[PDB]
């Protein structure tokens, strides 16, 4: 057998909600179902021709057997359509797309929906280890699952924000550099929102509660009228002696994203329109303490697999979990800053952990289309000391 | 670019612990680290040549960021080695192997460790989102994660055991048929244990508490099981039903892993391929009938391999419930003598995220012991899926 | 030895907060300390002459050893002053005062502060004993203490509201009758508030939070938007086929009340001014299913012990936990509706369960003073099938 | 009106269970029902001539509306019989009896069942009170109700055991003194058990569970073959440099006790046999840090009210919550050790907090009968810095 080509046929995302914000009552699985259905619709594929659904999701606690399969079922897909759920932390949503592409390239499937989903506002709490056998006597604890499974380092026991401080120190990324980057992200996001740059990529969500009904269609994390002065006055969020603040880090957020990926000859034979070819993908490992540098080896490997140099890439989405690591990555790889996050990034837009990797890919494709660019790179760091990267080529 | 062949170079598992038994103080991730390291050792690969680690794990709650990655680091692999955690419920451990094989076949890696790990004893209890945003007024619930994320159907809200009842009714699988099958499994497992048939595949685990001892023998098998004792058991899930604790698997702890490699690269390194992965597939069925998942998965796997079922010499078909084991057999036409020759999960246990890899490890060793050529490993998956893999001994 | 006379020397309450409202950050014990201190101040007694403090409190869970004793200490009383906490559910605050009177009449004390305190907003949630001995396998429940220890029948396992439906059916109290009564309570309460009728009896509470700093002095439960039409449009709260709604029942509420009670000769010898003599008190029992009828036997007995007929009473406070039971009691006893709850009742004002019995007594005495009336009756029903009543005579 | 005389007509208790022991599946309320019914049977009163039931209960969390009233109903008393629940912490069970005597002396009742009940094994756990509005973000705690509501000082936030260390220091009570006292209590209890001395006072409890079925009739907390050597080897429980251990302090325990109390001339006219007259009672306050000294002012007051000197008392039950405080109280008052806790005390027998004050009164009465003594004193310390005492005259 010879390897096949894989293409993207559609790409969609929800608007990203704030913590306890507009999506705080909409399960991760319902957000996933929303983007799966929308990606199917927008691709104009026959929904009975979907071979698998692969979805990232990090905070799986309490969500029930295999969130990806629940989401595909809730989307309306037939019971015969398989799926599974991927946890590579912040990389989960892009890893899902990379696995879809691999399955297609390998001849194992022709059509897959892939992406990620996360609702952090609805993450649960855990009882301490004594609950099953009995607390007996004495107080106990309850553990926040966001922190335990999502935002704390399992190797070192400190917050991802501390890994960001480590990177800041190791690569000489100052508080002022981090705040300038943040303000840049805020400004680009505001301009993208105001110009309608995200209109094409966002599927609205109807939100119904006892109190109110409303349609959520605009990213709500951005901080209007951000200024260098307001940023410089914030206190550090993770260490009193540190540099990382709520203003130069992304947030806790809720959202989902998905893409239809298909074997190229099959998409063409079905009369569909390939939007981009997936050219390469790769993952990389680094020390957990320096997890924010994950994108460096992932990107190097991806570019090598694509037969490209970094300069060949027209547009880059590099996730902004923390300004500190965003900057250190860019400095190490030599990113042309004018090509990166042209519509703003996670500091403004948010970081729904299991969706973000797919979210950035969605934003990347649509930005390449708007600017008629040919080659794009999406990459992000991963808690536990990893990175993932993907290169796509517009058609 | 051309597709590559993938081979198994080693295969190992822990003994399977009972609920609150010998492995109940050993974290899933530590069990995973054990089997990763052992699989690497047994393969005689250079451990710096591992490209990725892929591990199944279902009850992820409270285990911390990306359990597979923690397990690979705890095994001693370098920080440059990537990994990720797979959740396809009961299929997770076999799915991980299938993903490893695929990555190899696709030229994206040369050497992967894959498998699965589960400690159901250590699964936590959970307060739902209301603990975070406020209960406000009125009662809430505290959820056993074993049930919520492992053993209850997310679509129907009832136990996997109820899906087994559905299957028993739909396919005419009686209580007596279920109990006969359970006794057979108990007998075969006891004979396998007694003859040393699991000795080659099991990596012992050192357990330290309190208690210091070595765990090396599967402890879920029920000594002196009888048709009479089984026939008297009360149904476990429905008072008018057929499924009991004696004709269903348990809640269990364990792990399993295999070294998978591109075939030319294994040979060039002077290693010994144990089997080639010939095909793999997944299938979807109604969640209410999830125990039937192996049927389409096996059909597809066999078709991908260019084989008929009769070509297969040995089969491992997981026994989550006798009801579904039997219905699956009837729908596929299994030769009962070729299936679960060393016993199955009714006797051995069902550590959910590991079981898919566990059966593969057991299959391969049984094929070696009996000098057989073709083997099939398959299992049902909560939520209405199945997975199957065919391997060919070298 | 001869029995002694007992008099009221002061009577005070907090304004009654709404659930999650103005008092929701002020602990029951701090509310109790506030009224204990104020009652002592208003009585003009030497505070070293207080022999005991007796406080009603129903939701004791998590409040620490003997809430009454914590309140007395927080009020500034010496550690030599004893106290204890009474739980007769809704009757607790009146029972505390009855006990104080009895102790004084029996020559066991000369001066006692009695009342009740409740913060329902701050009531905890609970894990039952399986948390201590171990869940083992399978789920458990997390119980709202308001419901478990306050508002659900321990005998029948249903809400107090269902007992109100039972009473509505048994005594033929219709939805319309209930709503007419509710509107009347709302109207009397609004007029009493507006005319200042509660100024003398209320002690203000200072409230400080991160968000707000303010003084709470006006009952906030009353519903300005009350009309027969709005009330008729409400859905039943407890039974879809029933009559009881949020509009014709009291609320979940926060508040406290206290009174200084003294032996009569001693109050006079100290140069203090008795406000009223406690003439009698009694408790009664009825079926838990019909607990709202508790006041009938309690009142009958209290009247007999006072040597009075119901027509001798000038003013009545009969608590309005539910219009259904308020009305059924009144019909049974033959209350002159113009003498009852002249400043409005709990449907408008609220029902902080362990305080309400003392609260109504405070309201009664001040209303008797305003109207120069001689004989008063305070009575209320009690979950679990009881009632309590007290008759007082102005001096 | 003139005061009346109050007599005890019956006195009964359960055996005391160990933590997680024989009574650990029998609710406090069911234990209370068992002693209420037995006390009524033993008194030979018409089985419905009860005016009120008054029960002590400290850990009321999650037990439902007014545990005393649930207990009286479960005992089979008619719904017309009133009841309430008392919380004066460790003093609750004796406080209930005192209140019953006061109501009778006051002419307000003729026949009351009073006592206390506690099941510490079944005490629940509490979520942080913020769970109602939400933990929001970050780890939290779960609180043991035994500790929060029973065993920790609400004023100082430390364990009753620490108050015991405070008293040991203040009054010079050494580890060796404490251990000698403990061994003495163990020995007396073992001899009392072996001689049948508790047989008359104990009501057996049938325990039926899925696992086990048996009759519980013998106190199970006593430690068989206690020695000075085993005691001297124990580690301190509450402070590493301290004196208080599991061997010289009481336990966490389950149990209940109740008495029928009646007006004297009416008991006689009914043909009943008074067992003792309640001669006096009182409560006292001390610093919470020194709560174990509570019995001193309570006992001084009770004796003064009875017109007696300490030396007139024939037998004393002084609770042994901690040897340290037991001894300090005895030294301060000058107790004749030969007259105190003649059948052993709580170090051997256990301390079911809301029951103990009634429990010791039951033991005192039966011991007076066995030794044909005339005057008895029952007293105990109370968390929060109180004490209570009662003097009885045989019968």
Spans of all domains in chain B: 1-125+197-277, 155-196+278-391
Interface contact flag, B132 D134, Cβ < 8 Å? yes
As a whole number of angstroms, the distance between CA D63 and CA D67 comes to: 6
Q: Find out whether C95 and C283 touch, Cβ atoms under 8 Å.
A: yes
- The DSSP bridge partners found for residue B261 are B7, B111
Q: Find out whether D182 and D338 touch, Cβ atoms under 8 Å.
A: no
Find, among B83, B86, B97, B27, the residue nearest to B53 by Cα. B83
Q: How do strand D52-56 and strand D82-87 relate by DSSP bridges? A: parallel
Give Cα separations from B145 to A87, B58, B150, C143, D338 (angstroms): 18, 10, 7, 20, 59
B132 chain-C contacts, CB cut-off 8 A: none
CA A364 to chain centre: 12
Interface contact flag, D106 C3, Cβ < 8 Å? yes
Interface contact flag, C134 A132, Cβ < 8 Å? yes
**B1-125+197-277 and B155-196+278-391: identical CATH topology:** yes
Helices B322-332, B160-171: inter-axial angle, 10-degree rounding: 40
Distance from CA of C323 to the nearest CA of B (A): 23
| Torsion (CA) B306, B307, B312, B317 in degrees, nearest 10 | 90
Distance from CA of A198 to the nearest CA of D (A): 30
Radius of gyration of chain A (CA): 20
Catalytic residue among A6, A90, A159, A366: A90
Interface contact flag, B132 D132, Cβ < 8 Å? no
Q: Which CATH number fits domain C155-196+279-392: 3.30.930.10, 3.30.360.10, 3.40.47.10, 3.40.50.300?
A: 3.40.47.10
**What's the resolution in A?**
1.8
CB neighbourhood size of D199 (10 A): 12
B251 chain-C contacts, CB cut-off 8 A: 137
Q: Which of residues 194-253 of C touch B (CB under 8 A)?
A: 252
CB neighbourhood size of D176 (10 A): 12
As a whole number of angstroms, the distance between CA D19 and CA B115 comes to: 45
If DSSP codes are grouped into helix, strand and coil, which group holds residue D317?
strand
Name the phi and psi angles at B260, rounded to 5: -115, 140
As a whole number of angstroms, the distance between CA C366 and CA C392 comes to: 12
- Active-site residue, B49 included: no
Q: Find out whether C181 and C323 touch, Cβ atoms under 8 Å.
A: yes
- Residue of chain D with shortest Cα separation from B136: D132
The 3-class secondary structure across chain A, one letter per residue, is CECCCEEEEEEEECCCEECCCCCCCCCHHHHHHHHHHHHHHHHCCCHHHCCEEEEECCCCCCCCCCHHHHHHHHCCCCCCCEEEEEEECECHHHHHHHHHHHHHHCCCCCEEEEEEEEECCCCCEEECHHHCCCCCCCCEEEEEHHHHHHHECCCCCCEHHHHHHHHHHHCCCCHHHHHHHHHHHHHHHHHHHHHCCCCCCECCEEEECCCCEEEECCCCCCCCCCCHHHHHCCCCCCCCCCCCCCCCECCCEEEEEEEEEEEHHHHHHCCCCCCEEEEEEEEEECCHHHHHHCHHHHHHHHHHHHCCCHHHCCEEEECCCEHHHHHHHHHHHCCCHHHECCCCCHHHHCCCCCCHHHHHHHHHHHHHHHCCCCEEEEEEEECCCEEEEEEEEEC
Distance from CA of C291 to the nearest CA of D (A): 10
- Residue of chain D with shortest Cα separation from C159: D65
C131 chain-D contacts, CB cut-off 8 A: 124-125, 142
Interface contact flag, D141 A139, Cβ < 8 Å? yes
As a whole number of angstroms, the distance between CA A171 and CA A181 comes to: 15
- Active-site residue, A153 included: no
Q: Which of B60, B65, B284 lies closest to A60 in CB terms?
A: B60
Q: Which residues of D are catalytic?
A: 90, 351, 381
Give Cα separations from A86 to A23, A59, A100, B105, B360 (angstroms): 22, 11, 11, 20, 22
A252 chain-D contacts, CB cut-off 8 A: 137
Question: Which technique was the structure solved with, according to the deposited record?
Answer: X-ray
Residue D256 DSSP one-character state: E
The 3-class secondary structure across chain C, one letter per residue, is CECCCEEEEEEEEECCEECCCCCCCCCHHHHHHHHHHHHHHHHCCCHHHCCEEEEECCCCCCCCCCHHHHHHHHCCCCCCCEEEEEECHHHHHHHHHHHHHHHHHCCCCCEEEEEEEEECCCCCEEECCHHHHCCCCCCEEEEEHHHHHHHECCCCCCEHHHHHHHHHHHHCCCHHHHHHHHHHHHHHHHHHHHHCCCCCCEECEEEECCCCEEEECCCCCCCCCCCHHHHHCCCCCCCCCCCCCCCCECCCEEEEEEEEEEEHHHHHHCCCCCCEEEEEEEEEECCHHHHHHCHHHHHHHHHHHHCCCHHHCCEEEECCCEHHHHHHHHHHHCCCHHHECCCCCHHHHCCCHHHHHHHHHHHHHHHHHHCCCCEEEEEEEECCCEEEEEEEEEC
Q: Which of D68, D79, D82 lies closest to C287 in CB terms?
A: D79
- Residue of chain B with shortest Cα separation from A24: B133
If DSSP codes are grouped into helix, strand and coil, which group holds residue D157?
coil
Q: Does D139 touch chain A (CB under 8 A)?
A: yes
Taking one residue from A and the other from C, the number of pairs with CB-CB distance under 8 angstroms is 18
As a whole number of angstroms, the distance between CA C53 and CA D389 comes to: 18
Interior CA angle at B264 toward B263 and B269, to 5°? 100
Find, among B163, C321, D141, the residue nearest to A135 by Cα. D141
Q: In residues, how long is chain C?
A: 395
- Residue of chain C with shortest Cα separation from D147: C64
Distance from CA of C246 to the nearest CA of B (A): 14
Taking one residue from A and the other from B, the number of pairs with CB-CB distance under 8 angstroms is 218
Interface contact flag, D137 A146, Cβ < 8 Å? yes
Q: Does D5 touch chain C (CB under 8 A)?
A: no
In CATH, the number for domain C1-125+197-278 is 3.40.47.10
Interface contact flag, A89 B66, Cβ < 8 Å? yes
Interior CA angle at B297 toward B291 and B300, to 5°? 155
Task: State the CATH class of domain B155-196+278-391.
Answer: alpha beta
Burial class of residue A99, CB neighbours in 10 A (0-12, 13-18, 19+): buried
Question: Given phi > 0 = left and psi -120 to 50 = alpha, else beta, which region is A332?
Answer: alpha
Residue D216 DSSP one-character state: E
Q: Find out whether B101 and B357 touch, Cβ atoms under 8 Å.
A: no
Chains within contact range of chain D (3+ C-beta pairs < 8 Å): A, B, C
C142 chain-B contacts, CB cut-off 8 A: 127, 135, 139-142
Q: Which of residues 252-271 of C touch D (CB under 8 A)?
A: none
As a whole number of angstroms, the distance between CA C330 and CA C335 comes to: 5
Give Cα separations from A49 to A4, A82, B281 (angstroms): 18, 12, 16
Catalytic residue among C90, C159, C184, C366: C90
Q: Which CATH number fits domain B1-125+197-277: 3.40.50.1000, 3.30.450.20, 3.40.47.10, 1.20.140.10?
A: 3.40.47.10
Catalytic residue among B90, B153, B159, B365: B90
Q: Find out whether A254 and A352 touch, Cβ atoms under 8 Å.
A: yes
As a whole number of angstroms, the distance between CA B293 and CA B385 comes to: 5
D124 chain-B contacts, CB cut-off 8 A: none
- Residue of chain D with shortest Cα separation from C92: D84
Q: Which of residues 68-127 of A touch D (CB under 8 A)?
A: 125, 127
CA C107 to chain centre: 27
CB neighbourhood size of C344 (10 A): 24
CB neighbourhood size of D133 (10 A): 15
If DSSP codes are grouped into helix, strand and coil, which group holds residue D225?
coil
Q: Find out whether B87 and B57 touch, Cβ atoms under 8 Å.
A: yes
B132 chain-D contacts, CB cut-off 8 A: 134-137
Q: Which residues of C155-190 are buried (b: 16+ CB within 10 A; e: fewer)?
A: beebbbbbbbbbbbeebebebebbbebbbbbbebbb
As a whole number of angstroms, the distance between CA A313 and CA B344 comes to: 53
Helix (H) or strand (E) holding D205: strand D205-208
Q: Does A131 touch chain C (CB under 8 A)?
A: yes
| Contacts for A68 with CB less than 8 Å, ≥ 6 apart | A32, A53, A54, A55, A57, A83, A84, A85, A86, B87
Q: Which of C137, C141, C147 lies closest to B144 in CB terms?
A: C137
Interface contact flag, A142 D140, Cβ < 8 Å? yes
Interface contact flag, B133 D136, Cβ < 8 Å? yes
Q: Find out whether A146 and A383 touch, Cβ atoms under 8 Å.
A: no
Distance from CA of D141 to the nearest CA of A (A): 4
- Active-site residue, C82 included: no
Find, among D36, D392, D10, D385, the residue nearest to D201 by Cα. D10
Interface contact flag, C142 B135, Cβ < 8 Å? yes
Q: Find out whether D262 and D278 touch, Cβ atoms under 8 Å.
A: no
Q: Find out whether D64 and C148 touch, Cβ atoms under 8 Å.
A: yes
B143 chain-C contacts, CB cut-off 8 A: 139
């Amino acid at each position: 057998a010879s390897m096949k080509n894989c293409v993207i046929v559609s790409a969609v995302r929800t608007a990203i909600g704030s913590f306890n914000g507009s999506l705080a009552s909409t399960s991760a699985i319902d957000l996933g179902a929303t983007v799966i259905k929308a990606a199917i619709e927008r691709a104009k594929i026959d929904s009975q021709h979907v071979d698998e659904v692969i979805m990232g999701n990090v905070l799986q606690a309490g969500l029930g057997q295999n969130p990806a399969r629940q989401a595909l079922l809730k989307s309306g897909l037939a019971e015969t359509v398989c799926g599974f759920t991927v946890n590579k932390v912040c990389g989960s949503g892009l890893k899902s797309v990379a696995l879809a592409a691999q399955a297609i390239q390998a001849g194992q499937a022709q059509s897959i929906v892939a992406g990620g989903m996360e609702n952090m506002s609805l993450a649960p709490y855990l009882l301490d280890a004594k609950a099953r056998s009995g607390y007996r006597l004495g107080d106990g604890q309850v553990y926040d699952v966001i922190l335990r499974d999502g935002l704390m380092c399992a190797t070192h026991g400190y917050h991802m924000g501390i890994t960001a401080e480590n990177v800041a120190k190791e690569y000489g990324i100052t508080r002022e550099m981090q705040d300038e980057l943040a303000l840049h992200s805020q400004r680009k996001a505001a301009a993208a929102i105001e110009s309608g740059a995200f209109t094409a990529e966002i599927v609205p969500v109807n939100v119904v509660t006892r109190k109110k009904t409303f349609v959520f269609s605009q990213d709500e994390f951005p901080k209007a009228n951000s200024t260098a002065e307001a940023l410089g006055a914030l206190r550090p969020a993770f260490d009193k002696a540190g540099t990382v603040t709520a203003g130069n880090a992304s947030g806790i957020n809720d959202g989902a994203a998905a893409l239809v990926i298909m074997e190229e000859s099959a998409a063409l034979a079905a009369g569909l329109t390939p939007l981009a070819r997936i050219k390469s993908y790769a993952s990389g490992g680094v020390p957990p303490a320096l997890m924010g540098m994950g994108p460096v080896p992932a990107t190097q490997k991806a570019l090598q697999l694509a037969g490209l140099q970094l300069a060949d890439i027209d547009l880059i989405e590099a996730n902004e979990a923390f300004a500190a690591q965003f900057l250190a990555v860019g400095k190490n790889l030599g990113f042309d800053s004018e090509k990166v996050n042209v519509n703003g990034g996670a500091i403004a837009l948010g970081h729904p952990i299991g969706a973000s990797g797919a979210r950035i890919l969605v934003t990347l494709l649509h930005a390449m289309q708007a600017r008629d660019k040919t080659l794009g790179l999406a990459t992000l760091c991963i808690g536990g000391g990893q990175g993932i990267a993907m290169v796509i080529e517009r058609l």
